[PDB]
Structures are given as C-alpha cells and as structure tokens.
Amino acid sequence: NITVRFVTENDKEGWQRLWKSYQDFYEVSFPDDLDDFNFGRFLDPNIKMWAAVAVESSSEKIIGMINFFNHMTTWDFKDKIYINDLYVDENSRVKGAGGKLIQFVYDEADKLGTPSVYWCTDESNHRAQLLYVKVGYKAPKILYKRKGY
Amino acid sequence: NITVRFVTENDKEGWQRLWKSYQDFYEVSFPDDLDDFNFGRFLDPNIKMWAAVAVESSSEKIIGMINFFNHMTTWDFKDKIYINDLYVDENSRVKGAGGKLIQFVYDEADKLGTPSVYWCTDESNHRAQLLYVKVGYKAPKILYKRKGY
Amino acid sequence: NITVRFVTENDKEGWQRLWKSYQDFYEVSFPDDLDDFNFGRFLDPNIKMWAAVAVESSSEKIIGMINFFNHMTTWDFKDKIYINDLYVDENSRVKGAGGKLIQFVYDEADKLGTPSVYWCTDESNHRAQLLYVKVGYKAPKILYKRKGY
Amino acid sequence: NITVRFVTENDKEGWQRLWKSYQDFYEVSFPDDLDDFNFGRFLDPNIKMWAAVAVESSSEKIIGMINFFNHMTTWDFKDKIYINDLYVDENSRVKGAGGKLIQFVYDEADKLGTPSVYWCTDESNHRAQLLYVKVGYKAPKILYKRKGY
C-alpha cells in the first residue's frame, strides 16, 4: 500500500535522492542548484509548481516522485497541468506508485479548476506506456524542439 | 516581402480572421469570447503570452499568425517558450511566412533570455513538417493526455 | 522447459486452438475454412510457409504458435522471411515461449540461407515490444496500405 | 502527360538510370549485378515480380519506376502485392508519376484478384506521404527486424 502526498521540507532528501536517480535514468546531469531552486518553487504557495512523493506506508520510505506545474493555453480559458517528471523507485517491481501519483495530480487538478493534465515519454519506453494507456491516451501529435535545445 | 511584428489593438480584426480559419483547419470551435481573452493576454505587457502577425510588407494586410507563451520547467532555471499556434493563408502559406514567423519567436525568445522554444502538430500534418524539420527538429517523444481532456 | 518444433498433422487441434485465441486478440475472425488452407500450406514441403508450435515439455500441451513464410526482395538475391503470426497462451505466457519461437524462426531462416527475418506489431502493443526490442530492433519505417484493404 | 506500362527488354537501361538515382536517395549501394537479377524476374512471366515505368508522352523518356511483387498471407486465401520500390526523376518531380504509378499497380492487382496492396517509407518522408495519404492510409503498425539484418 503506497501513499501519495505533497512534499514537506523534510522530504527534500527522499525527493532529491530520486531526483539524481531520475537524472541517471535519462543520462542527464543538472546543476547542483536546481534541486534547491525546484524544492523552493515546490514549497512556495505562490509558484504554481508542485511536487508529490509516494511514501511507503509500511516503512515511511519515499518510493516515487512527481513534479508538475501550471501553464496557460491559447485554447480554453482554463490553464492546464503538465507532469514534467515522474519516477518511481528502481528497486521494486509491480507495486502501484506512478499509478497512484498520476491520480493524485488528477485529483489536485480537479480541485484547482484545471483538470486538463498531460505529459510525455520516449517512444522507446514501453514499460511506462503500459500504465499511461490505462490512465490516458497517446495524442497523435509530434513534438518539435528548436535546434540545440 | 512580408514583415513580422507583434500585434496591436488594430490587428485584432485581422488576427481573428486567421484564428477562425485556424480553428477550421483543426476542426474545432472555440467560444467566440475566448478570442477576446487571448488578445487581452497578448496585449498585456505583464501576462507572458504574445502573438505576432505576418503582414504583406508594402501591401498592408495580414497573412500569418503565431501565438506563443512562456512557462516554467523543472529541468532548468530559465523558463521556456511554447508556440501554441501557427497559421498562414492557404496560398501565401509556402511563400516564407511560417518560417519567417518561427524565426521571430526564436529571435524574441533570445532577447527574453528564454531561448528554448518548442511546439508540435498532428503526426499526419506532413505539409507543415516539410518546414518544421528545417527550422527545428523532431523529438523522439510520444505525447500523453488525461482521458476526456 | 519449452520445446519449439515444426507442426505435425497431429498438432492441428493445438495450433487451431491458439489460432482462434489469436484472432479475437486482434479482433478479427477469418473464414473457418482458411485454417485448413494455412495448415495445408504448412505441411506442403513445396509451399514455403511454415508453422512452429511451442510444446511444454512436462505435459504435451501446445502453448505457443509462430507462423512465418518466404518472399522475394528487390534489395537482394536471397529471399526474406516474414513472421506473420506470433501467439503464446495467456495463462502460459509467463515462461519464455515467444522468445524461443522467434529464435526458432531465426535458426530455420539460417538453415535456409534466407536469414533476413522481420515482423510487425501494433504501436500500442507495448508488452510484446518489451520482447521484440531485445530479439530485434525497430525499423524507422511507416507502413501504408491501400484504401479498403 | 505520362503513361505507365510494364517494362520491356528495351527499358532496362532507362530503368537502371532510376535504380541508381533511387539508391543514392536511400543512401545505399546494391551489388554490381542485382539490376540484371531483378530485371530477370521482372521479365520472366512466371516469377510474379513486376516492374513498370512511367514515360513522358512527348519526350518518350522514362520518368519513374515502381517495382512490386506478389506474396502469401496467413490472413487470407488471396495473396498481397507489395510495392517494394517507388521513384520519380528528381529533374522531373511534382507532376503526376507516382500517383499514376501506384494506380497502375492497383489496376493490375485488381485483374490479378490480389487487390491487397501495400508499401513502406521513412517516417520522416513527408514529401512522399503527401501523396501516399491520398491513395492509401497509414497502418498503425511498427515494423521490427532481426537484430543483425
């Protein structure tokens, strides 16, 4: 039994742990400051950027993390929520985290008046997509980024 | 020739013309009072949502539209820009407009100190991708949305 | 353990069993008199179409089915082999049948001089692609069919 | 105004002109004597691998080629036809050959009682997909190939 909740200052290590692990799985290394810079935005009630954690109820251990935020849209008056990061514990298979995390965001999104939630992954990632199809649907869109970015 | 520039109160009548046929192309129908909000945000210096227009330089009229906005990311200190809409008239569409517009967003994105620009389209929108591949690159990302949203 | 072998006349019942199950997975229903035609070709040494089954050693139960055939190319001299159907019993999918059925086809292709093996699957079939990505590689190709077909 | 016909013994040289242009385009170099092989089966009325060329009405010069062939299915009594190669002269692109080349195949397949025609292209081949989309439709398949080949 997993347990999803918003992060507290005392969750900075459990989250920061996964954060580095998430940088590993993805082959990236962000400046050492970003950790704080994000956690700040996560805690400040004015910055519409949240982070949640999946804590193992039977051991008080931080399993997964989910970072999301708000942003406008020229379509519709209501803003939308983007799940920028999602990373469950690499040392445990067939639990429930990620499913429970994606749902927490759905719930918190509904209360905010911005129910429209979205995210993306690598086409190659099939393990994660087993879930995403249960909780969402693959949009027939092709993402395009500026060269060098 | 063609000239790209940010919209002013007077470009609204022209911009809306593109916006309407843009909705036509995408087989959607936004509530007419949404346009007003959009343009409101474009014009507000404080709300980081802009809209540029491609006018037939030395011929007056409008032929292109690009709506974009700034939003935060967990992967970097600086923010990023998302081109939410792009639309040229079915004729002068291929005569430079779309590429000229996408560069405007790049050049402006630079000034803003927030260069990481990005967008997307339907996988089946080949005509547009003939240009997209030049000015930008396809990301190996599949996009997922919440069911019913 | 698992044994993968060519189908004998005595495995028509077992093969047909899975062939039917296979059909409703793919949400299709071929004419009942096609099963025979296939099997007919399977057994005809002169019809370059084969059918291997994965027999669970312990019992005699057939748990796997792989259908493949030979066809020309305009990019080589040696023909290539297409794996048309791959199916492993839902309940007995646990072990590793599908993995060794593809290997069987890999080896038989070698013993035939036409080692170029290939298949295709739905974009959404992530469970299968967890395997296909190991024993093979995704080709940067898009398949197009004639309308009505 | 373009006219498609099955290659004659007197078309081999002009067809070979394309075969090479085609190779360049696809960044490949087939073995020295493959042209002869294909053209062998192309002309043998017992192999079931045809090739047709589109020649200019006035100029009488061969413009494009289309190599296609027959092959079995475990999904039908009828065999499918696969357009293996489609290529138009770069010097003379954006005219009509290709759309007419594919059409020829449809018409010839219909007489053959094997109307189920299909082909492939690189995901990023938007130019050809502007056409493909009009005459066929993207199959939601993902092609996998044997690791080595």
From Swiss-Prot, chains A, B, C, D:
E.C. designation(s): 2.3.1.48
InterPro entries: Acyl_CoA_acyltransferase, Diverse_Substrate_AcTransf, GNAT_dom
Residues in N-acetyltransferase domain copies: 2-149
Domain of life: Eukaryota
Site (Important for catalytic activity): Y132
CC terms in the record's Gene Ontology section: cytoplasm; Hpa2 acetyltransferase complex; nucleus
Record: residues binding acetyl-CoA: L86, Y87, V88, D89, E90, N91, S92, R93, V94, K95, G96, A97, G98, G99
A matching Pfam family: Acetyltransf_1
PTM annotation, UniProt: Autoacetylates in an intermolecular reaction.
GO biological-process terms attached to the record: polyamine acetylation
One Gene Ontology MF term: N-acetyltransferase activity
Catalytic activity: L-lysyl-[protein] + acetyl-CoA = N(6)-acetyl-L-lysyl-[protein] + CoA + H(+)
The keyword ATP-binding is annotated on this UniProt entry: no
Keywords assigned by UniProt, alphabetized: Acyltransferase, Chromatin regulator, Transferase
Family according to the record: Belongs to the acetyltransferase family. GNAT subfamily.
Record note on quaternary structure: Forms homodimers in the absence, and homotetramers in the presence of acetyl-CoA.
Role summary: N-acetyltransferase that acetylates histone H3 at 'Lys-14' and histone H4 at 'Lys-5' and 'Lys-12'. Also acetylates polyamines like putrescine, spermidine and spermine, and certain other small basic proteins like nuclear HMG proteins.
Protein name: Histone acetyltransferase HPA2
Organism: Saccharomyces cerevisiae (strain ATCC 204508 / S288c)
Lineage of source species: Eukaryota, Fungi, Dikarya, Ascomycota, Saccharomycotina
Name of the coding gene: HPA2
